[PDB]
């Protein structure tokens, strides 16, 4: 019965055995078969008497709090029928990760190893996050958002352990995408003598890679890192078992904007006359997120006008107003 | 005949009874499949709380009727 004493061991006349309790105290018990050999395994809670100091029973594994840096979302709700117009970024993404996961057996018979990883850089504001979750849904991966600043602990090692726990759960839950918010805290270590300070970040990264190539032939876990733009890092783009693949996001084109507009126009009322292709010619160098902000502005015209839908005009006027990154309205010069 | 008792969890369960059964008998049948002690059961039907010595026929509780089972929040 709880309250009970657990012990977190990290240790792998007659025979002596050392137990490490989480009260950070080493204790003597014998391993003469009064205490069975199968009640010790590292990394694991095992159940020790309070004042008799002896392993009666073994309890499930745990080291720190469970899912401490990790968000768990079993299977996103998104699809590539929800996220669409991003089609080329779907092709790259599918060839690097999805096909090694699906056809794992095929990679084994072929007798190459599987790449497990990609690195993405290039602009979001198009549904980069949204695409990542789509891939997650499609492959039937568990989506794990792991935030790179949480590891980066000011305390000793604990961060290193967190990287290992991530792999451990990821391998149990397989298929899995480990989706890494930032790249600034498993990276940005520079090449100067300030790479000293930035140790915690070199160590979290190194381990995650060492661990992937450790298991490169089997495609169970995927690693994806995301940023606006590529940062200084240790070499890792040169190797299948690391994050081999380096995937670029470009900007949309007329076909892509128009699909993105048709996805937008299901959600919200329209007067069902609005021509995406025509509006798409009228917007120059727009991204997906910005076509979504035009829909909001088109509705702000509508809000003032006393309309509950939007006509073509209502959208044209929406574009003229700011979306804050690019807006087509230029006609001034005398 | 078969009647219904909406338990505390919001669920309806069924009970097999006779127009001659008393509210004490019914409460015993409820204890059997729900596990609540009769002395803790308050049964409502048609806005009336059912008294222990009366019978289902007294209240005109026919087949498929639904009784509402409630406990008590003592205070004063």
């Amino acid at each position: 019965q709880l309250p009970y004493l657990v012990a977190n061991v990290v240790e792998v006349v007659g025979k002596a055995a050392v137990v490490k309790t989480s009260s950070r105290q080493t204790v003597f018990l014998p391993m003469v078969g009064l205490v069975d050999p199968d009640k010790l395994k590292p990394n694991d809670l095992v159940g020790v008497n309070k004042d008799s100091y002896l392993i009666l029973d073994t309890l499930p594994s745990e080291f720190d709090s469970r899912v401490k840096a990790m968000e768990v979302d079993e299977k996103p709700t998104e699809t590539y029928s929800d996220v669409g117009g991003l089609d080329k970024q779907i092709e790259e993404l599918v060839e690097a990760i999805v096909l090694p996961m699906k056809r794992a057996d095929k990679f084994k018979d072929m007798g190459i190893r599987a790449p497990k990883g990609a690195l993405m850089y290039g602009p979001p504001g198009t549904g980069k996050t949204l695409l990542a979750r789509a891939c997650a849904a499609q492959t039937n991966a568990t989506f794990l958002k792991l935030a790179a600043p949480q590891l980066v602990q000011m305390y000793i090692g604990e961060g290193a352990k967190l990287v290992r726990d991530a792999f451990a759960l990821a391998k149990e839950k397989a298929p899995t995408i480990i989706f890494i918010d930032e790249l600034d805290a498993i990276g940005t270590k520079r090449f100067d003598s300030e790479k000293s300070g930035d140790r915690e970040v070199q160590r979290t990264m190194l381990e995650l890679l060492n661990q992937l190539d450790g298991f490169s032939s089997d495609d169970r876990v995927k690693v994806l890192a995301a940023t606006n733009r590529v940062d200084v890092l240790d070499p890792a783009l040169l190797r299948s078992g690391r994050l081999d693949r380096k995937i670029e996001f470009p900007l949309p084109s007329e076909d892509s904007r128009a699909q993105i507009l048709q996805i937008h126009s299901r959600k919200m009322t329209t007067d069902d006359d609005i021509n995406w292709q025509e509006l798409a010619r009228s917007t120059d160098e727009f991204n997906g997120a910005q076509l979504k902000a035009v829909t909001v502005e088109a509705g702000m015209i509508a809000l003032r006008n006393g309309q509950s839908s939007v006509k073509h005009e209502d959208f044209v006027e929406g574009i003229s107003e700011v979306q804050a990154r690019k807006s087509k309205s230029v006609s001034f010069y005398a | 005949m078969q009647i219904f008792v909406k338990t505390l969890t919001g669920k309806t369960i069924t009970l097999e009874v006779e127009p001659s059964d008393t509210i004490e008998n019914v409460k015993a049948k409820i204890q059997d499949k729900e596990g609540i002690p009769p002395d803790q059961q308050r049964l409502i039907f048609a806005g009336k709380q059912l008294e222990d010595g009366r019978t289902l026929s007294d209240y005109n509780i026919q087949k498929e009727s639904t009784l509402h089972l409630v406990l008590r929040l003592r205070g004063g």
Partner: protein, 359 residues
């Protein structure tokens, strides 16, 4: 009088309290960041024993417990930053923040100008005012109202005053985080504050989170760190994530302030971060006039003032400068000992203010 009534209150309070202590002694015994019931005799699993700490652990997977109503024990209790969870004995509030920030419920500064800031106010009105007054309008259209606003030109242009005024009208909280303070030089500390601000934000939804100065923090990211852009980008990049990552739109507002426009990144510009760009930069002649007219109503004045004339002497202003002309004009009068303001005084205040601004 005042003394007898204070004692009478103590006596009354105390008796209830003494009884209550003994009851607490017999059982051997909400914000919170881990739960810690340090014993648990009362209460897969069919009973609670939950205690989240490095040095020991008691783990039960199953919360609830409408009888006994759990809690008690070695008291920090509720939901966990590990999700074992005190689910629902005495109010948890989703991992609720013990790290504070400055809250100003209903900030009081109503409507400094309503004329000559005419368009800029109206932008605020669509985004912020109307979606609190009617959520159903917005819903019916199917649009989601601007998540974030960027306010530009110099800060303290009466930028603050206007923002506060709409917040009063709607009865909404100002949540002030000042960019400059965050700056620590210890591992991860700033970004940690940011996560807890948003968790706290979701709980408190209907709030304008004011982020002072993006010149301060998140000013570059093109460096790939430097020790002082590396915590600073860490905090920054984390803060964006949270925003596109969803917080409710039409409740929680984030307002950014900036003096200079060279700090901005493509990351910052994009929707789900900034959608609005509201001006508080340079107004018109007709406009300068309205803001002058507006501050001098409250004042007594003796006749011969035309606002147009006062406006004329400004070759370029910001809202800050205008506020300085009315208030400075009043000072020349007080030195001479006066309650009234004159055309001469207003001219004298324009000449001083503009010339100091130069260079």
């Amino acid at each position: 009088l005042k003394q007898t009534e204070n004692d009478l209150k103590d006596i009354e309070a105390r008796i209830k309290e003494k009884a209550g202590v003994k009851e607490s002694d017999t059982g051997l015994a909400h914000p919170l960041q881990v739960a810690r019931c340090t014993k648990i005799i009362k209460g897969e699993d069919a009973k609670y024993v939950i205690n989240l700490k490095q040095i020991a652990k008691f783990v039960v997977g199953l919360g609830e417990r409408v009888s006994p109503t759990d809690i008690e024990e070695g008291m920090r209790v509720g939901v966990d930053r590990s999700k074992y969870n005190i689910e629902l004995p005495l109010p948890p509030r989703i991992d609720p923040s013990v790290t504070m920030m400055t809250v100003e419920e209903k900030p009081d500064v109503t409507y400094s100008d309503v004329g000559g800031c005419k368009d800029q106010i109206e932008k605020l009105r669509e985004v912020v005012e109307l979606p609190l007054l009617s959520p159903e309008r917005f819903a019916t259209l199917g649009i989601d109202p601007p998540k974030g606003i960027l306010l530009y030109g110099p800060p303290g242009t009466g930028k603050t005053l206007c923002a506060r005024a709409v917040a009063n009208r709607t009865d909404a909280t100002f949540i002030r985080v000042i960019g400059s303070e965050l700056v620590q030089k210890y591992v991860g500390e700033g970004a940690r504050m940011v996560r807890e601000l948003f968790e706290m934000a979701r709980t408190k939804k209907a709030c304008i989170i004011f982020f002072d100065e993006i010149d301060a923090v998140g000013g570059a990211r093109f460096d790939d760190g430097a020790g002082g852009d590396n915590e600073v980008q860490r905090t920054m990049l984390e803060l964006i994530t949270q925003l596109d990552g969803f917080d409710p739109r039409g409740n929680i507002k984030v307002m950014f302030a900036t003096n200079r426009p060279n700090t901005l990144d493509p990351a910052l510009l994009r929707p789900g971060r900034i959608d609005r760009k509201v001006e508080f930069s340079l107004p018109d002649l007709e406009g300068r006039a309205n803001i002058f007219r507006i501050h001098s109503k409250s004042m007594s004045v003796e006749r011969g003032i035309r606002w147009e004339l006062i406006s004329r002497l400004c070759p370029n202003s910001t809202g800050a400068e205008l506020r300085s002309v009315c208030t400075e004009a009043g000072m020349f009068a007080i030195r001479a000992r006066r309650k009234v303001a004159t055309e001469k005084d207003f001219l004298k205040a324009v000449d001083k203010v503009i010339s100091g601004y130069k260079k």
